[PDB]
Enzyme design. Structure first.
Site, PDB file in Angstrom:
ATOM      1  N   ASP A 197       1.479   3.967  17.196  1.00  0.00           N
ATOM      2  CA  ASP A 197       1.739   4.889  16.100  1.00  0.00           C
ATOM      3  C   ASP A 197       3.242   5.074  15.932  1.00  0.00           C
ATOM      4  O   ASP A 197       3.948   5.374  16.898  1.00  0.00           O
ATOM      5  CB  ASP A 197       1.057   6.226  16.369  1.00  0.00           C
ATOM      6  CG  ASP A 197       0.562   6.894  15.104  1.00  0.00           C
ATOM      7  OD1 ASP A 197       0.614   6.252  14.034  1.00  0.00           O
ATOM      8  OD2 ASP A 197       0.119   8.059  15.179  1.00  0.00           O
ATOM      9  N   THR A 230       5.200   3.895  10.396  1.00  0.00           N
ATOM     10  CA  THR A 230       5.984   2.732  10.800  1.00  0.00           C
ATOM     11  C   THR A 230       6.061   1.710   9.675  1.00  0.00           C
ATOM     12  O   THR A 230       6.879   0.783   9.717  1.00  0.00           O
ATOM     13  CB  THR A 230       5.401   2.104  12.067  1.00  0.00           C
ATOM     14  OG1 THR A 230       6.221   1.002  12.476  1.00  0.00           O
ATOM     15  CG2 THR A 230       3.987   1.608  11.823  1.00  0.00           C
TER      16      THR A 230
HETATM   17  N1  LIG Z   1      -7.837  -6.320   9.430  1.00  0.00           N
HETATM   18  C1  LIG Z   1      -6.651  -6.367   8.775  1.00  0.00           C
HETATM   19  N2  LIG Z   1      -6.163  -7.533   8.302  1.00  0.00           N
HETATM   20  C2  LIG Z   1      -4.986  -7.597   7.653  1.00  0.00           C
HETATM   21  N3  LIG Z   1      -4.207  -6.527   7.420  1.00  0.00           N
HETATM   22  C3  LIG Z   1      -4.576  -5.292   7.837  1.00  0.00           C
HETATM   23  C4  LIG Z   1      -5.849  -5.141   8.558  1.00  0.00           C
HETATM   24  N4  LIG Z   1      -5.969  -3.835   8.856  1.00  0.00           N
HETATM   25  C5  LIG Z   1      -4.869  -3.203   8.370  1.00  0.00           C
HETATM   26  N5  LIG Z   1      -4.036  -4.073   7.766  1.00  0.00           N
HETATM   27  C6  LIG Z   1      -2.745  -3.732   7.118  1.00  0.00           C
HETATM   28  O1  LIG Z   1      -1.889  -3.045   8.032  1.00  0.00           O
HETATM   29  C7  LIG Z   1      -1.204  -1.987   7.363  1.00  0.00           C
HETATM   30  C8  LIG Z   1      -1.084  -0.782   8.285  1.00  0.00           C
HETATM   31  O2  LIG Z   1      -0.518  -1.200   9.524  1.00  0.00           O
HETATM   32  P1  LIG Z   1      -0.608  -0.268  10.832  1.00  0.00           P
HETATM   33  O3  LIG Z   1      -1.962   0.402  10.860  1.00  0.00           O
HETATM   34  O4  LIG Z   1      -0.172  -1.099  12.014  1.00  0.00           O
HETATM   35  O5  LIG Z   1       0.510   0.865  10.598  1.00  0.00           O
HETATM   36  P2  LIG Z   1       0.098   2.379  10.246  1.00  0.00           P
HETATM   37  O6  LIG Z   1      -0.632   2.960  11.435  1.00  0.00           O
HETATM   38  O7  LIG Z   1      -0.544   2.409   8.880  1.00  0.00           O
HETATM   39  O8  LIG Z   1       1.534   3.090  10.138  1.00  0.00           O
HETATM   40  P3  LIG Z   1       1.677   4.687  10.020  1.00  0.00           P
HETATM   41  O9  LIG Z   1       1.244   5.204  11.370  1.00  0.00           O
HETATM   42  O10 LIG Z   1       3.140   4.882   9.710  1.00  0.00           O
HETATM   43  O11 LIG Z   1       0.755   5.055   8.886  1.00  0.00           O
HETATM   44  C9  LIG Z   1      -1.994  -1.664   6.108  1.00  0.00           C
HETATM   45  O12 LIG Z   1      -1.119  -1.606   4.976  1.00  0.00           O
HETATM   46  C10 LIG Z   1      -2.983  -2.800   5.938  1.00  0.00           C
HETATM   47  O13 LIG Z   1      -2.734  -3.486   4.711  1.00  0.00           O
END
Ligand SMILES: Nc1ncnc2c1ncn2[C@@H]1O[C@H](COP(=O)(O)OP(=O)(O)OP(=O)(O)O)[C@@H](O)[C@H]1O
Ligand SMILES: Nc1ncnc2c1ncn2[C@@H]1O[C@H](COP(=O)(O)OP(=O)(O)OP(=O)(O)O)[C@@H](O)[C@H]1O
Ligand SMILES: Nc1ncnc2c1ncn2[C@@H]1O[C@H](COP(=O)(O)OP(=O)(O)OP(=O)(O)O)[C@@H](O)[C@H]1O
Lengths: 514, 523, 521
Positions: free
Chosen positions: A47, A81
């Protein structure tokens, strides 16, 4: 010294420095970071909020970006992030034109023009699907798979979907205080599930207690049944040790007269067979009082919390009582299966199958200490993502499908304020493509190989294209079930324009003296 | 090692970056050259303590002497020195005018570049203001010469050239040059500076000097011949002594009887060499080296006028006057290497025997100004005042136009240029306004050398020119900071001398400002 | 993994050295592009100072310090040989080609993929170049505007009009009826003691050494030219004899007997003068390269024969083409079939020396361009300006297709390379995108030399769009988008053809290097 544009070149190196650090933890294919407290506390997280608020950086410019992600979780709860990865490339692509002689105010005037066009583009790609069980699984799958090593990704979806669906009725607003999060040791990580009732920390400690009560009347109590002070005008006086034995029997007689009164209220209201009685007294209970109640079939609980007592008011229905001298049956409640769950060391009372508790307790089990805090920060990020899906009925495609579609919409767009704002929509289109770029590096594929295939995919229809985490091919987000929130992407483009402005709007840095 | 040298990639030459202001280093190069000659301008200017490369001491204030001895090495400052040699061509004045005005041009150009103006736009405003400066300069012509070829017209107009070259000789040097140029002034279009040759004899002072016609040498006639009208002049740089062959020529002496034979044989060979000049009809022999006592007896035997000239600079003057080429051999009897002169005779001026080389059947344009002085240092300063006095009037064989001086043509030119720069639209009004303020530094250099505050003189000059009172210049007085009329005092410079001076100093600002990098290259 | 007496860069930092070396050479040569650019200074170390703007002199004669920048200096030696134009603009393309390619190398792209996009964008820009060029016939109006494009960058805007008419009429007189033009037919001469604006044209040929006699004619209206290569001075014997004398006085008489073989040939020149056109209002000119005795010069000068001596070998080659006279190596075979003719043969005097002229000929096949200047560095700069101006008009008549200047080609080529689909690979468009912004550095740096904004000039010339053929360029005085085809800013097709070929070859070889190591250093 250095009264020049060198104050901008040091601030973008803190933005490029914070971009290269937090780029290895986006998506499920990314890595993790460790948070060492110096004393021995080890915590693993992906996170970005805890990676900026709890994590401390030495650079003063990068400390401002740590205050950006703290403001991100208060309104949405997701995309902290991802906020850093856009503004890292926003100030990186700005340096290609500032060194050519352009003022940073002109690029700021072009960034606000690209923000209004991209926010209008978000209204056309959103899907107003009806919220049901199946579409909330795909929203929970995009959020929980980035905090899980893919052994709890299948079990934790039905725990958070059925919890928020049990509290979504009669068009009421979703309240996160209705969800209670409890943690227990001595179990595996896959043994987590949902609990209809509440979980009490301390249960009944008596050998004559009932192991399970199928139906009972719950009396809410808050009276300290331990050694208390005098309620009548008297004092504590004694001449020897034998006078204390007479005084302790004259003082405790103010307690057991109330304990026998609960038995008189038990025999009066529903004193026949096929009944039960549980005491949920928050304060301490005399160990001699536990023998008096367990002989007639009363399970007595002690050492509760203040927030748990309010949840016991909504579960059973009993009014919180302050004195046993005016005991009355309207302070009684009702519950179903009241039994004790046995662990290796302790025991926990479970009061499920309530009438209308309006509170669901999530039971998270873990073998290690840092494993419990990782899922606890994962369930709070997962429940807030589904809460953004129910209150905001429109959702957007995931896997970076919005950012690639916004890059083509910003290319076919002419500025209407000046001609020099053409670089403002140019640099905003290139910085938004860093999310399909960084998803190729974390997945282990080439960066430019899947960027060509995600941009060459066009048709004469409505079609979205995203990156593949397994094969690196063009993948439709609607066909596989990868979806994000419209509220998160609306706050993403709004917060990125504000923060990249304020780093571009400085020219001098001075040492203050309070 | 890392990091590398920014922009210095050619033979390790110091290439200053944009923050290091590579174009500003050429401005400081011409600022230091202009500061050595800023305090040297005017009659109240300071002298310069010149130490020559041959370890000879000199005290002088000529602008040409400072540039020749102070060996500049910066090539950005060499553009003005090469323009100052162009100022030496076609006119003999304005060498300090090039160094001061172009130095004030680049000093005011540095204030324009600090705002953010491009160097390609400022240089286009200087060529615009240069063409505007060439239009008001015929309009600033007040009077002209009378063209009567008398002494009073020449001596009244020569007071400008004698000013600031040799102060105190304003009444003496104005009449000495006036008696020389009027012998060439009937020859229209034939007045040349190399026709007037300067000679110097160690004497009492300036008031003992005189002017003579023809070529006059300070050395007296070694022979007893007083006057001869022979045309054949045979110049010999070799000394008159015994004959040494170009062959081996081993002369052996053992006893005293061979001492008297070869010494008489050297006297007989010395008699044969004088006889080798007598048969060809040459009675005029100039000896470059020493003359023996026996050679003086052979001079009066054949009645040949022998004169001895030790200096090579006066021997080279006869080579370009009569056509006689100096022969290094012991008197070769040839005729093609001889000269032509109508009459040569010996005469005295100030109890000093001098030899005169004049022409009577030819019209005659050779003049010699016999200078007298106690010290050789101050006598050389008057010698350079003759060359800058004749070249002041060598340009007057052209169209005779005179402008007033002493800041009279400087403030009036700065007034009308600013009026053209105020009405001109566009960004080019900044370069024309600084072209007018570069014209104010030359009366500022004239007032600061006189011990007067420069801002008080400039405001006094702009008050009288605003009311239309033209031809007002600086009054030369340290105690009186007022001004005076230039037509009543008698200061009138040359229009053509002011024409090439503004043209060459503006092009010096063109050439330096186009150079913004210095690179050393190996052949 | 390294040996002593060597220095090897094993990591990927060896690619960052050659990129930053060419980026440093880009910022040096970007201040002298166009007529609004500045000049550079040439310090020879001894005191010779020259100011030139030509990129050949700034790279070939100019010595370098960095070894990587020495390779780009050898590019201008190859660029001057084929077209003679565009050496300053060639370095600016490679200076931005390796800078723009460095943004994708930091993302992990291989340089082989980027250099393959440069080959795909080369053929797209070359096929676009055939539609930009105009195949109009050349005339006096177009060749002036071609000369006004090239000569104005080496001129301080005071000699632009007087040098334009000199380079046009000299080329139009040495090329007609589709003959191949030779730049060696134009003789370049230099003269002192005048102003810089006194550069004019000479129909004949300027010779250095003239006649030295007071009885020589200062101007001859018509004279017969006789080309010789034999010395008319005192020479050695021709028959089997020797130096036989009784004393030193007898040696001067055998020289007179030796001069009888020489003075017989001098009387044959007077014999050919009187019989062949020896009447009134006629003359004779001897152009013998070797020396002639002044005693033989006395008999020729009294007859009106202007005899010259001590000429050069390059001058005698043009004298045989101007008058048509066959060079005579033996006076025994003297015949009037080898006699030439010329027009006004006069000797104009200067302040220092004297030089003759053989102008006013019908077709001498040699035009001499006489340059006059007060300084030595100005005399070399105008000579450098003429040879840069003569090559731009030479390419316009041989190759009739000309392109609009002022960056109008590179702006229209940037629109074609951006609107282009990938045809050879998927990732090859990243090399096309970097090559699309590489051509935009030519209108970018032209706004910096003129003093205007870099982005206000680039946007306004890129927003010019219509449903017709429109090629707009930069304006150095106003800053507005200006059509360069209308105002008369024109370049050659061979310049832009070699600009696309040499840039995609050299920037390939800098990107394709891997390690830098010392082989004996
Ligand atoms: N199975 C998947 N395949 C491809 N891309 C994905 C998948 N799951 C999520 N994503 C992409 O990853 C992004 C989010 O990344 P991540 O969850 O690592 O950060 P986050 O937790 O959203 O960040 P923050 O905590 O700041 O909200 C989303 O915009 C989404 O498009
Ligand atoms: N006594 C004076 N009265 C008025 N003006 C003067 C006087 N002396 C000098 N000037 C001014 O000085 C300028 C020329 O002065 P100056 O005699 O120093 O030059 P210069 O020494 O002749 O030049 P060069 O070094 O070539 O000989 C002129 O503009 C003239 O007006
Ligand atoms: N009158 C003009 N107005 C605007 N731009 C011009 C003009 N003349 C030339 N240019 C531009 O300047 C460029 C050439 O500049 P410059 O003459 O300084 O280099 P060059 O001398 O041609 O190069 P090299 O030294 O290799 O021969 C051309 O590409 C052309 O587009």
């Amino acid at each position: 010294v250095a009264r020049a544009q060198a104050a901008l070149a040091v601030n973008i190196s803190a933005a490029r420095g914070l971009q290269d650090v937090l780029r290895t933890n986006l998506g499920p294919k990314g890595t993790m970071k460790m948070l060492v407290s110096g004393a021995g506390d080890i915590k693993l997280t992906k996170d970005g909020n805890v990676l900026l608020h709890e994590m401390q950086i030495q650079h003063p410019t990068a400390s401002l970006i740590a205050k950006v992600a703290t403001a991100q979780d208060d309104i949405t709860g997701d995309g902290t992030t991802s906020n850093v990865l856009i503004i890292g490339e926003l100030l990186k692509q700005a340096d290609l034109y500032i060194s050519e002689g352009l003022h940073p105010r002109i690029i700021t005037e072009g960034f606000e023009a690209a923000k209004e066009k991209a926010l209008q583009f978000l209204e056309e790609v959103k899907v107003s699907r009806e919220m049901d069980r199946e579409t909330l699984i795909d929203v929970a799958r995009t959020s929980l798979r980035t905090k899980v090593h893919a052994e709890l990704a299948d079990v934790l979806t039905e725990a958070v979907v059925d919890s928020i669906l049990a509290i979504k009725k009669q068009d009421e607003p979703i309240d996160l205080f209705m969800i209670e999060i409890m943690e227990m040791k001595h179990k595996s990580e896959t043994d987590t599930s949902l609990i209809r009732g509440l979980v009490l920390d301390h249960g009944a400690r008596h050998p004559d207690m009932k192991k399970r009560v199928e139906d009972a009347y719950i009396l809410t109590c808050n009276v300290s049944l331990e050694y208390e002070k005098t309620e009548v005008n008297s004092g504590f006086f004694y001449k020897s040790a034998e006078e204390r034995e007479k005084l302790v029997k004259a003082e405790r007689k103010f307690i057991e007269d109330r304990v026998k009164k609960i038995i008189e209220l038990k025999r009066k209201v529903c004193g026949d067979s096929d009944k039960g009685f549980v005491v949920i007294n928050q304060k301490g209970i005399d160990p001699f009082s536990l023998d008096a109640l367990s002989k007639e079939g009363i399970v007595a609980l002690r050492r509760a919390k203040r927030r748990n007592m309010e949840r016991l008011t909504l579960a059973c229905g009993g009014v919180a009582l302050n004195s046993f001298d005016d005991l009355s049956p309207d302070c009684l409640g009702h519950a179903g299966l009241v039994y004790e769950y046995t662990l290796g060391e302790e025991k926990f009372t479970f009061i499920e199958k309530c009438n209308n508790p309006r509170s669901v307790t999530l039971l998270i089990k873990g073998p290690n200490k840092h494993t419990l805090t990782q899922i606890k920060d994962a369930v709070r990020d997962g429940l807030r993502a589904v809460k953004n899906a129910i209150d905001d009925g429109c959702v957007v495609p995931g896997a970076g499908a919005v950012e690639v579609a916004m890059a083509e919409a910003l290319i076919k767009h002419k500025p209407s304020v000046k001609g020099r704002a053409q670089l403002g929509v140019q640099a905003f289109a290139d910085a938004l493509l860093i999310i399909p770029k960084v998803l190729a590096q974390n997945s282990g594929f080439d960066l430019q190989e899947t960027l060509v295939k995600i941009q060459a995919e066009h048709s004469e229809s409505g079609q979205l294209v995203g990156v593949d985490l397994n094969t690196g091919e063009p993948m439709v987000a609607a066909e596989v079930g990868v979806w994000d929130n419209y509220c998160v992407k609306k706050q993403l483009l709004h917060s990125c324009t504000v923060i990249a402005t304020n780093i571009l709007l400085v020219d001098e840095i001075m040492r203050a003296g309070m | 090692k890392a990091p590398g040298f920014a922009q210095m990639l050619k033979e390790g030459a110091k290439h200053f970056s944009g923050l290091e202001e590579a174009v500003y280093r050429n401005i400081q190069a011409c600022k230091e050259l202009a500061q050595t000659t800023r305090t040297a301008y005017g009659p109240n200017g300071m002298n310069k303590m010149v130490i020559n490369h041959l370890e000879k001491l000199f005290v002088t204030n000529d602008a040409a002497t400072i540039l020749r001895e102070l060996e500049v090495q910066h090539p950005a400052a060499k553009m003005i020195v090469m323009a100052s040699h162009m100022q030496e061509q076609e006119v003999g004045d304005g060498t300090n005018f090039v160094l001061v005005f172009a130095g004030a041009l680049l000093e005011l150009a540095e204030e324009l570049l600090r705002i953010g103006l491009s160097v390609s736009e400022v240089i286009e405003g200087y060529e615009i203001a240069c063409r505007k400066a060439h239009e008001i300069l015929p309009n600033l012509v007040c009077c002209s010469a009378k063209n009567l070829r008398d002494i009073d017209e020449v001596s009244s107009l020569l007071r400008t050239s004698i000013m600031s070259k040799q102060y105190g000789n304003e009444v003496f040097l104005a009449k000495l040059i006036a008696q020389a140029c009027v012998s060439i002034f009937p020859d229209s279009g034939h007045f040349n500076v190399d026709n007037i040759r300067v000679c110097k004899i160690l004497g009492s002072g300036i008031s003992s000097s005189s002017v003579l016609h023809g070529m006059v040498f300070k050395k007296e006639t070694e022979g007893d011949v007083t006057s001869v009208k022979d045309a054949k002049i045979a110049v010999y740089s070799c000394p008159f002594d015994g004959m040494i062959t170009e062959t081996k020529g081993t002369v052996l002496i053992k006893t005293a009887e061979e001492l008297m034979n070869f010494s008489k044989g050297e006297e007989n060979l010395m008699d044969a060499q004088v006889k080798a000049i007598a048969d060809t009809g040459a009675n005029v022999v100039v000896t470059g080296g020493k003359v023996a006592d026996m050679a003086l007896h052979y001079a009066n035997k054949y009645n040949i006028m022998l004169v001895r000239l030790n200096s090579k600079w006066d021997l080279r003057r006869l080579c370009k006057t009569v056509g006689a080429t100096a022969l290094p051999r012991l008197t070769p009897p040839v005729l093609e290497e001889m000269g032509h002169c109508d009459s040569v005779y010996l005469s005295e001026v100030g109890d000093t025997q001098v030899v005169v080389f004049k022409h009577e059947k030819e019209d005659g344009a050779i003049s010699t100004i016999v200078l007298r002085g106690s010290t050789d240092n101050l006598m050389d300063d008057i010698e350079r005042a003759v060359d800058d006095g004749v070249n002041t009037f060598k340009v007057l064989t052209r169209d005779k136009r005179l402008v007033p001086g002493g800041g009279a043509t400087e403030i009036e030119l700065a007034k009308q240029i600013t009026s053209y720069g105020e009405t001109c639209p566009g960004l080019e009004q900044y370069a024309i306004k600084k072209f007018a303020e570069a014209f104010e530094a030359i009366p500022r250099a004239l007032a600061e050398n006189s011990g007067v505050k420069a801002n008080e003189v400039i405001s006094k000059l702009y008050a009288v020119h605003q009311e239309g009172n033209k031809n007002v210049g600086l009054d030369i007085e340290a105690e009186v900071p007022a001004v005076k009329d230039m037509l009543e005092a008698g200061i009138l410079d040359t229009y053509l001398g002011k024409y090439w001076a503004i043209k060459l100093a503006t092009n010096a600002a063109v050439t330096v400002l186009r150079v913004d990098q210095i690179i050393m290259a190996k052949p």
